[PDB]
Amino acid sequence: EFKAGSAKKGATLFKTRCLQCHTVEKGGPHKVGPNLHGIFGRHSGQAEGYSYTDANIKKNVLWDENNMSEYLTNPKKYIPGTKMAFGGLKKEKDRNDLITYLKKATE
Amino acid sequence: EFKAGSAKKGATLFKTRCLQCHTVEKGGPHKVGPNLHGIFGRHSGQAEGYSYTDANIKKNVLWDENNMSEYLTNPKKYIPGTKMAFGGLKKEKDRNDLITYLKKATE
Amino acid sequence: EFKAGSAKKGATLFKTRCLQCHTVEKGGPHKVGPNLHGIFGRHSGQAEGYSYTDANIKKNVLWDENNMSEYLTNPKKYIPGTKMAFGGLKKEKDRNDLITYLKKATE
Amino acid sequence: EFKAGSAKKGATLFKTRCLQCHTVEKGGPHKVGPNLHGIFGRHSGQAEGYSYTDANIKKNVLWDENNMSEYLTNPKKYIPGTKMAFGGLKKEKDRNDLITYLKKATE
Ligand code: HEC
Ligand code: HEC
Ligand code: HEC
Ligand code: HEC
């Protein structure tokens, strides 16, 4: 149940918590995790060049601001068996800010 | 088609041609290429902690002495689009010796 | 470092120093060396149908006018272990003229 | 292949990735690495008071914005056997920004 926030703060959140494993630019490299360009409006596990786990592809969730917020609260609880090593942004304002940035940075 | 050979000579072949990108010990580090412990009897692209290419995971070949010999003759021809930069041991005795060592060194 | 020059002179340079081992036309044959069509903007060792050395593929240099000039000064010094038997065009005006021609002849 | 960028950002890139081993001011001290004043337009290994490796002097590359960008992508791949312990700025924008600063800071 997403509500938009500060994209400037979300940039700092992404750079500190996600940038180590992910890239956002169109046609960026796949670090530990896959490139996230065009992640919104795309099924889970459909990034070319990345070897996803069975769980990530089987979830087949069409990413949007609402299910992304649920995913980022507890990645393991949302997709059990995900290789993404991340506890989760537990504050709702954090997820809202991060997703606000991620929406523009990946379109 | 594999035939066993000199494991002492295969160690020299591995150390000169593979050691720069690969490690064999149980729980070794992932250099340019992945750690090869337990490579035999395991699917291609199933080493933990390594980011494989799309081609290497898609091949899904269960490694054995025979398909490894074919792979090491021409890695690009066997798995088209592999990031492993290696032309290939073209002599059959070289592949047999290297695989003889690699079998013991990775079990 | 690269500066454009006489493409007419570069054609004479290519025909006298490179044409024996290389072809430039789209879909030309691989003589002693590989076909050079689309060499610019492509990684080193990515020509289809040619067996490159380990050194040429491992260099993985994205060819451009600047690194080509450095390569053509001393091919062995730039890519140690290259099977290309060529000392190198030591004059800068020579490399500039040759690359000026090679840019149009291979696009 | 160099294109100019942000010298303000390049100052931050140099201070975070290079300042530990290098100094830029005219007549600065040689830390782990040599002083880089007047590095552009000078041959590799010609800084007074510094003990370079055999590989760094043997490369004898006349430094410029283009070959520096290639060097900073992968120092070991460019000069094999360099004692400079640095993986390399893999983003092109980062090399462009750093070199833009380094050009003014070392002249
Ligand atoms: C490395 C330790 C990671 C950190 C920190 C973050 N992510 Fe992650 N991500 C990582 C991996 C290994 C994977 C693959 C998951 C699998 O099991 O296959 C992912 C995946 C994602 C996805 C899904 C993409 C898709 O299905 O197409 C998303 C949306 C994602 N990661 C987002 C994300 C964000 C926003 C992060 C910071 C809060 C973040 N990740 C951190 C590895 C790592
Ligand atoms: C670095 C330039 C390499 C050299 C030399 C050798 N290998 Fe390689 N290897 C390298 C990479 C980057 C990869 C990843 C491939 C990909 O596209 O994902 C590999 C992979 C392998 C594998 C497959 C492992 C698996 O699928 O689990 C094997 C079996 C392997 N390498 C073996 C091997 C041997 C025996 C070598 C010397 C003859 C050798 N490699 C050299 C990088 C490099
Ligand atoms: C035959 C004796 C050669 C002459 C004369 C020239 N080239 Fe060469 N070239 C030759 C070989 C055998 C190879 C393969 C190198 C290897 O080790 O795999 C090459 C390769 C090149 C490349 C690299 C192509 C790529 O990596 O895709 C280039 C750009 C190239 N050759 C250019 C070139 C030019 C411009 C020449 C005349 C000045 C020239 N070559 C001469 C063999 C021979
Ligand atoms: C210490 C761990 C280093 C870091 C981080 C960086 N550099 Fe480096 N540099 C270091 C050493 C030990 C050397 C000597 C190399 C040798 O083998 O002799 C160097 C050298 C250079 C050079 C070459 C200078 C010359 O040949 O005159 C350049 C241009 C250089 N270093 C640049 C540079 C930049 C821009 C860095 C940050 C991105 C950087 N270095 C980091 C040690 C270390």
Author numbering:
A (entry chain D), B (entry chain B), C (entry chain A), D (entry chain C): -4 to -1, 1 to 103
What did the paper state?
The presence of b-sclx8 was evident in the unbiased electron density maps, and a stack of three b-sclx8 was modeled. A tube of electron density running through the center of the calixarene stack was modeled as PEG (vide infra), resulting from the use of PEG as the precipitant. The trimeric stack is ∼6.6 kDa (approximately half the mass of cyt c), ∼2.1 nm long and held together via CH−π and π–π interactions. As a consequence of the stacking and the projections of the extended arms, the b-sclx8 trimer presents four hydrophobic grooves. Each groove accommodates the N-terminal α-helix of one cyt c by binding the methyl substituents of Thr8 and Thr12. The Thr12 side chain is flanked by Lys11 and Arg13, the latter forms a cation−π bond to b-sclx8. The polyether chain forms multiple van der Waals contacts with all 24 of the phenolic hydroxyls.
Water-soluble, anionic calix[n]arenes are useful receptors for protein recognition and assembly. Here, we describe the protein recognition and assembly activity of p-benzyl-sulfonato-calixarene (b-sclx8), an extended arm calixarene. A cocrystal structure of p-benzyl-sulfonato-calixarene (b-sclx8) and cytochrome c (cyt c) revealed a surprising assembly.
